[PDB]
Design a protein around this ligand. Structure first.
Ligand SMILES: */C=C/S(=O)(=O)Oc1ccccc1
Length: 282
């Protein structure tokens, strides 16, 4: 069997050798180094691939798994909020999915600014947060939606759709059913906002580095990785793309931690099996 135990074990082995190789060495050339004093990486061990770094002062990365293009990042630190909102605005973000739990945001010990649930003023950028719908994704998992309006003198006003999953505990994997429902919601939201931009002849439509869904939460390598993995499998353009490829790609494009937990890898494995998608490369 292609999804049997022998196959799973072999997948883990390759991915594990990959994780170990990608581990960040001190001043590693492959990873973005902190500009000069102010913290860059929320977690010293969880770095940002330099060749795909979106901004010099953010732990964020452009990620292309197959034909699916997104952006994965850590929860912006307090001091990176302005830069963070700029990335959001310039990317004409079709959708921002935040998989960090409400508990986490509330815990001031974690330094995770409640930047999307309330209005705020960071630098010369002023943000307007507005509540919209709320959607249950199954298993008691809830999607709280907002619209972030990025305003900045001299700059074009950009509104961003936000999908906030407030009860997906860190380092855990929700069911394949929920993950599937989530990707559908995120892909959907991104699709509607993109249509608006397309309908207005926005130039950002042709640029591949723009209009990318931004997914994250605390570190941007677990719940984030799982969602992005489920999102590429949702795109028909990725026929045959292996699970090995998917993770291999997320890791090389951000860090070797992408798809942090085994149960999170299982979910992608379950989904891929449901599509007859291969696990290993031949
Ligand atoms: C976006 C958060 S995560 O993808 O679940 O990754 C993570 C967060 C905090 C500690 C370890 C991993």
């Amino acid at each position: 069997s292609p999804y049997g135990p022998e196959a799973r074990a072999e997948l883990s082995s390759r991915l594990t050798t990959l994780r170990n190789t990608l581990a960040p060495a001190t001043n590693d050339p492959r990873y973005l180094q902190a500009c000069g004093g102010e913290k860059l990486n929320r977690f010293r061990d969880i770095q940002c691939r330099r060749q795909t770094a979106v901004r010099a002062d953010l732990n964020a990365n452009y990620i292309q798994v197959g034909n699916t293009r997104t952006i994965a990042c850590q929860y912006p630190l307090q001091s990176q909020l302005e830069s963070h909102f700029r990335m959001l605005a310039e990317n004409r973000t079709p959708v921002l999915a935040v998989l960090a739990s409400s508990s986490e945001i509330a815990n001031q010990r974690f330094g995770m600014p409640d930047y999307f649930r309330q209005s705020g003023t960071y630098g010369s950028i002023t943000v307007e947060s507005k509540m919209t719908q709320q959607v249950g994704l199954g298993d008691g998992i809830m999607a709280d939606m907002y619209t972030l309006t990025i305003r900045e003198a001299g700059q074009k006003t950009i509104s961003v759709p936000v999908v906030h999953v407030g009860n997906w505990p860190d380092q855990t994997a929700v069911s394949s059913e929920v993950t599937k429902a989530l990707a559908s919601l995120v892909d959907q939201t991104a699709e509607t906002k993109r249509n608006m931009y397309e309908s207005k002849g926005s130039s950002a439509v042709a640029d591949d580095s723009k209009l990318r869904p931004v997914i994250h939460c605390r570190a941007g390598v677990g719940r984030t990785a799982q969602l992005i993995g489920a999102m590429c499998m949702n795109d028909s353009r990725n026929s045959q793309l292996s699970v090995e490829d998917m993770v291999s790609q997320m890791r090389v494009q951000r860090n070797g931690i992408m798809v942090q937990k085994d149960e999170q890898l299982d979910v992608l494995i379950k989904l891929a099996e449901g599509q007859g998608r291969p696990l290993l490369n031949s």
